[PDB]
Ligand binder design. Structure first.
Ligand code: HEM
Ligand code: HEM
Ligand SMILES: [Cl-]
Ligand SMILES: [Cl-]
Ligand SMILES: [Cl-]
Ligand SMILES: [Cl-]
Ligand SMILES: [Cl-]
Ligand SMILES: [Cl-]
Ligand SMILES: [Cl-]
Ligand SMILES: [Cl-]
Ligand SMILES: [Cl-]
Ligand SMILES: [Cl-]
Ligand SMILES: [Cl-]
Lengths: 455, 452
């Protein structure tokens, strides 16, 4: 079959279609018009956007397709080097860091992180408990305070103290500016245009701000007398079984930056979206709050209790279905091959998995794909393979998946235990794109249930 | 046909990701020779560097003026004025016939007193500098040349020497022309990220048109009788058609002449003084002519015509750094260039003038040396070897105006001052479509010869 393709603009081809600050949402609309697959071309770019489970289950076959670095990830390489997210599977530092750092996401590691997650989550509840009458909550800002501080403490034994600051942490501001440049730069067909020197300088300035924090974390660890076994301990001391080598200092810096970014941004979005969907669906909020009150019988949650919050987990997965906060990943053909029986591909041909569209495949989920109902995830073993991919695929899947879901389940159930929530502005969903997704401007009011906390 | 390194679908575009594209193109020409193809998104052209091929491109029966991408962008500023119009556009020939008498010998003799007025202001500024002070040469050459076209062409005094900084028209003009130049490298121009460039470009065009408005209103209100460029724009009838230029085109012509009428002449004067201070033996010979010929307190028209060596200095400065360094042509029909490059109707050529002017088969092996004596016998220079003022019916209409102004001013500078290259200035050629030696500074020591 001949592959659908959206409107072309001469030698720019499809490039002008993404002259917007919401490209992923723009691509979802093209997918609605063109269907399960369409080609997308720009100067120096050929890729194919996949939106059906039928085709994406083939693309998730690791014997036939490997992870590709999209243009966006290549630009992010200037920030995160050959860290785990922005390295090729064949680069020696991917496999090496993967084996060195995977033990930091074992069950025993998670049980060790729990108390530190509780530390930050209690700070969030306390902030909201202490608001005055008619004050409201800026939800993404506060979810970012929590998730950045959580990965800082759990991964690096470092306190960013984001809740002690009225404005976003400086690292956040520079990160957003850097990643925003990475998103914008995709539309620069000729990025070495002399006029781009200022963006490049600002880009380097922001990377410097982020590396200044990395420098502080490393100096802090070197000076500390505390016995840790967190991520940073493994980065500094773990040896790859295959090679017997540790990560060198250059790659450690890249991993720190990688985990400071990847370990909070998408989790902040998820929590923001989850709370958005709850206040838009009060019957779901009430059901999730009932589970929280029944399970969380202690002043602070235990690890075991968080594992029993089944419905909250369903809520989080259904929020990831509708708005997966890392909404696409890229693949390339390892060999000449035919996709879906209809689309011949040459070795090196690139695919984009458009996760929000996948997650709206009506052949999988039914006709009501736009509706928010966690009950879809009652029986997870019934969901077809590769229908639900908010955490990527295969050996290049998200290494932090269980970290994120444990954190988000913990925090959301504690929010639901301790407060009633009002959508006092009748907020209109506005999804900001900075590679990742978030509900910009989302605000709520919280009314405390006056249930006390502990340690 | 030779072609430089390509970059996928961007073709040759990334080779001109520089502030100095013409100088980059000269280096490609050094490597690839008399002709190379250059492609970009929406662009195919062929850069010519040899007199052998350029003499054919200058055959008006085979090739007509083309609007390069740069000139198409300048069209947003100067519309269908004489520089940015197509030859077959009605307003080109109509305006050409109506304004050509403004550049006759009769008209030049009338401009002379007004050129001397501005030249005298230049000299008196430098006479009045304190010992610790120096000259910013291009800035003062731009003060002079803009005021000269304003006064001679439009009977309007911009009074650039009464301003410590560049004239606002200049600042906006440069910024607008810099946008036009940079847009050649801007492949996705309708990205919203470009909105600010568009806003600024519109703002700078408005500043330039604000000056136009003031000139037009000044003439309307004037009780003095002028017979200058503006008189012919407003009242000249096209003999071939009996009709005058319309108001829209007149505005484009005023903008055109305010820009074209000064910017390249400012650069020429700047380069000429640069080469003189770098070649003191030539400076001495030129200064000796000025002192021998300019026997009066201010130069006369006749005296300027006797400044033969100063004229040779200016031509040699135009040889090495022609301040409008390229022009474009297209094939009127299918044809063969140089016996081996078939062209189809509409194919474009670029004449890379600085490389033409370094053709060793014309000028000899010492093409980089500054030697005005090259032009001692102008008739012995082959046709189409020396093309600083363009070609054919689309050649510079202001050529004699520019050379009279620069000869007058340079000879007065040399008559009245000794010059010192006190910083040992390193040539840095800024490109804004046109060329100038950016940052060129000197100290001037007066000879204390009174003015008139
Ligand atoms: C809801 C929260 C999260 C979502 C939706 C998410 C999503 C994803 C996705 C889609 C990928 C695959 C990228 C690709 O194929 O190009 C990925 C990879 C990755 N994620 Fe996450 N992530 C989340 C949380 C986290 C957390 C909390 C961490 C760290 C603690 C983390 C660290 C990583 C790393 C290191 C990789 C690259 C792994 C590798 O390729 O070896 N992520 N994530
Ligand atoms: C050294 C100083 C100057 C140089 C090097 C120069 C150079 C040139 C060149 C190369 C062209 C041809 C452009 C093309 O083919 O696309 C041209 C055209 C033109 N120049 Fe000049 N010029 C100078 C001074 C002036 C002055 C003083 C004026 C006005 C008083 C002027 C007005 C024009 C006009 C109106 C045209 C377009 C003529 C037409 O096509 O009908 N120039 N000039
Ligand atoms: Cl571009
Ligand atoms: Cl440690
Ligand atoms: Cl909803
Ligand atoms: Cl998987
Ligand atoms: Cl795999
Ligand atoms: Cl926000
Ligand atoms: Cl016409
Ligand atoms: Cl020299
Ligand atoms: Cl010398
Ligand atoms: Cl001609
Ligand atoms: Cl300068």
């Amino acid at each position: 079959k001949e592959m659908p393709q959206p409107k072309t603009f001469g030698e720019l081809k499809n490039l002008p279609l993404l002259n917007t600050d919401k490209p992923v949402q723009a691509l979802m609309k093209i997918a609605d018009e063109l269907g399960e697959i369409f080609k997308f071309e720009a100067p120096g770019l050929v890729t194919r956007y996949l939106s059906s489970q039928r085709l994406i289950k083939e693309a998730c076959d690791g014997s036939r397709f490997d992870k590709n670095l999209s243009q966006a990830l290549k630009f992010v390489r200037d920030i995160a080097g050959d860290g785990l997210v922005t390295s090729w599977t064949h680069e020696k530092n991917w496999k090496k860091a993967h084996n060195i750092l995977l033990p930091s996401f074992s069950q025993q590691a998670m049980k060790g992180y729990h108390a530190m997650m509780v530390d930050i989550a209690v700070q969030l509840v306390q902030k909201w408990e202490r608001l005055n009458a008619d004050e409201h909550i800026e939800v993404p800002g506060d979810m970012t305070r929590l998730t950045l501080d959580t990965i800082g403490l759990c991964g690096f034994n470092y306190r960013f103290n984001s809740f002690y600051r009225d404005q976003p942490h400086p690292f956040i501001t520079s990160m957003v500016r850097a990643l925003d440049e990475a998103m914008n730069k995709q539309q620069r067909a000729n990025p070495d245009d002399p006029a781009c020197d200022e963006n490049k300088r600002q880009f380097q300035e922001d990377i410097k701000v982020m590396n200044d924090l990395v420098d502080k974390i490393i100096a802090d660890r070197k000076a500390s007398g505390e016995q840790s076994d967190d991520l940073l301990t493994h980065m500094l001391n773990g040896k790859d079984p295959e090679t017997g080598e540790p990560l060198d200092d250059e790659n450690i810096r890249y991993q720190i930056i990688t985990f400071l970014i990847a370990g909070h941004v998408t989790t902040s979005g998820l929590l923001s979206f989850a709370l958005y969907f709850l206040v838009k669906n009060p019957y779901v909020l009430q059901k999730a709050a009932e589970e929280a009150a029944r399970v969380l019988v202690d002043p602070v949650p235990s690890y075991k209790q968080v594992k029993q919050l089944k419905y909250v987990g369903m809520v989080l997965n259904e929020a990831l279905r509708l708005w997966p906060t890392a909404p696409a990943f890229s693949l390339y053909a390892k060999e000449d091959t035919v996709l879906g029986g209809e689309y011949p591909l040459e070795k090196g041909d690139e695919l984009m998995v458009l996760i929000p569209q996948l997650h709206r495949d009506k052949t999988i989920w039914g006709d009501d794909v736009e509706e928010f109902r966690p009950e879809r995830f009652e029986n997870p073993s019934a969901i077809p393979q590769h229908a639900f991919k908010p955490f990527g695929n295969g050996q290049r899947a998200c290494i932090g998946q269980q970290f994120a879901l444990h954190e988000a389940t913990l925090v959301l159930s504690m929010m639901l235990k301790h407060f009633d929530f009002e959508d006092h502005t009748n907020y209109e969903l506005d999804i900001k794109e900075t590679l990742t997704l978030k509900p910009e401007g989302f605000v709520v009011k919280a009314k405390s249930k006056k249930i006390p906390l502990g340690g």
